[PDB]
Amino acid sequence: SPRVVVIKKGSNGYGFYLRAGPGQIIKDIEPGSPAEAAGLKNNDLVVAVNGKSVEALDHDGVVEMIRKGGDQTTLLVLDKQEAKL
């Protein structure tokens, strides 16, 4: 399920980790972080950064796109749609 998450960088960054999924996925959102306030979710899959696709881009390339944006990042993400029932 897709959405656009704008996050303003704080004094200690955005407050999430980025690593390869089972693409690059969000992990370990820090409580009280800009990422948490922006509604980013653990296991969100990053499909674009600042309007640019991350297709076939490696981990370092995705991280660099995020850093190049300076004090803000706009992530297009797909939530993991696996429900525990």
UniProtKB/Swiss-Prot annotation:
Domain of life where this protein originates:
Eukaryota
What are the Phosphoserine sites (modified residues) in this protein? 11
Residue span, PDZ domain: 4-80
What tissues is it present in? Expressed in kidney, liver, small intestine. brain, lung, and testis (at protein level).
Q: Where in the cell is it found?
A: Membrane; Cell membrane
Record's function text: A scaffold protein that connects plasma membrane proteins and regulatory components, regulating their surface expression in epithelial cells apical domains. May be involved in the coordination of a diverse range of regulatory processes for ion transport and second messenger cascades. In complex with NHERF1, may cluster proteins that are functionally dependent in a mutual fashion and modulate the trafficking and the activity of the associated membrane proteins. May play a role in the cellular mechanisms associated with multidrug resistance through its interaction with ABCC2 and PDZK1IP1.
* Domains (record comment): The PDZ 2 and 3 domains seem to be involved in the interaction with SLC26A3. Interaction with the C-terminus of CFTR could be mediated through independent binding of PDZ 1, 3 and 4 domains.
User: Which family is it part of?
Assistant: Belongs to the NHER family.
The miscellaneous remark of the record is:
Disruption of the gene was not associated with abnormal growth and development or redistribution of interacting proteins. However, a modulation of expression of selective ion channels in the kidney, as well as increased serum cholesterol levels were observed.
Assembly and partners are described as: Interacts with PDZK1IP1 and ABCC2. Binds to the C-terminal region of SLC26A3. Interacts (via C-terminal PDZ domain) with SLC26A6 (via C-terminal domain). Interacts (via C-terminal PDZ domain) with SLC9A3 (via C-terminal domain). Component of a complex, composed of PDZK1, SYNGAP1, KLHL17 and NMDA receptors. Interacts (via PDZ1 domain) directly with KLHL17; the interaction is important for integrity of actin cytoskeleton structures in neurons. Forms a heterodimeric complex with NHERF1. Interacts with AKAP2, BCR, CFTR, SLCO1A1, SLC22A12, SLC22A4, SLC22A5, SLC26A6, NHERF2 and SLC17A1.
> What is this protein called in UniProt?
Na(+)/H(+) exchange regulatory cofactor NHE-RF3
Q: What fragment of the full-length protein is this? A: 241 to 322 of 519
